[PDB]
Design a protein around this ligand. Sequence first.
Ligand code: 6C6
Ligand code: 6C6
Lengths: 126, 135
Amino acid sequence: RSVYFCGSIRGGREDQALYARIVSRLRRYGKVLTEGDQFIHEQNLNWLQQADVVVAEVTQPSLGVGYELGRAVALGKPILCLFRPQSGRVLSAMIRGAADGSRFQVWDYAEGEVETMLDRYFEAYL
Amino acid sequence: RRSVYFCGSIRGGREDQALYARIVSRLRRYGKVLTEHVAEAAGGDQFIHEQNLNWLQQADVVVAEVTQPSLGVGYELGRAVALGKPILCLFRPQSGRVLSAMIRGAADGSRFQVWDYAEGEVETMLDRYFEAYLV
Ligand SMILES: O=P(O)(O)OC[C@H]1O[C@@H](n2cnc3c(NC4CCCC4)ncnc32)[C@H](O)[C@@H]1O
Ligand SMILES: O=P(O)(O)OC[C@H]1O[C@@H](n2cnc3c(NC4CCCC4)ncnc32)[C@H](O)[C@@H]1O
């Protein structure tokens, strides 16, 4: 399996710690592909096109993460978004509202059980 | 007349709210602005997504002010690219921040354009774009 991971970079780097934890756990389930700007865009689109599953941490607002998710939906890749409501933020209606059965899932989580949540997704929801 | 889809941060932050209202007002000169809302129960967000995607499908051109990072705006732009819609992104360097590489890196001739501009000059930039590519 090939996994494409999305997380804020230029939107802000604050959840770096958990992105690392998420990428580490994702390795158990497949090859994590994402572990000038035109070059970056083309590189990432190529990885997105070849991915079997897309996973995004969507707590920090980010144009690039949103864009990856939009491209991924249209490519028909199954998507898991992970959101932390304890931060006090409310998730974009365009992401929450993109939920679509097995094709697009948005899961709220508490930071301490992110690994448990990923296990559950790959075991029973994919 | 032509239809314009306008994108700008909401849950990403409303720092540029007044600017978005200026943009929507100026865009009305060139067509019907489908998304004036840019200028609730979570269980209603799928309704919003559906409504917005229907509008995005109808749109002749997609205009985004991308200075404020936003998942929704990014998603709108990704969906728009895949639908083949012409796109203008407007960004303010004086914000101090580096625009997402996925947005700047998406530039593609006249089809996807990213325009840096100075605070105060959004109306003249909109006019120049519409005059050149839509009128
Ligand atoms: O940069 P933001 O927050 O807009 O968008 C982040 C998302 O968009 C992709 N991305 C953005 N910039 C990237 C990038 N270049 C950055 C530019 C210098 C530090 C790295 N390299 C790889 N992927 C990138 C990532 O896969 C990430 O999931
Ligand atoms: O809320 P973020 O910043 O992720 O996304 C904003 C973008 O996504 C669309 N959008 C997001 N929330 C919307 C919304 N209502 C939400 C529910 C109450 C306020 C926000 N109504 C219409 N469009 C919305 C807008 O067209 C806008 O361009």
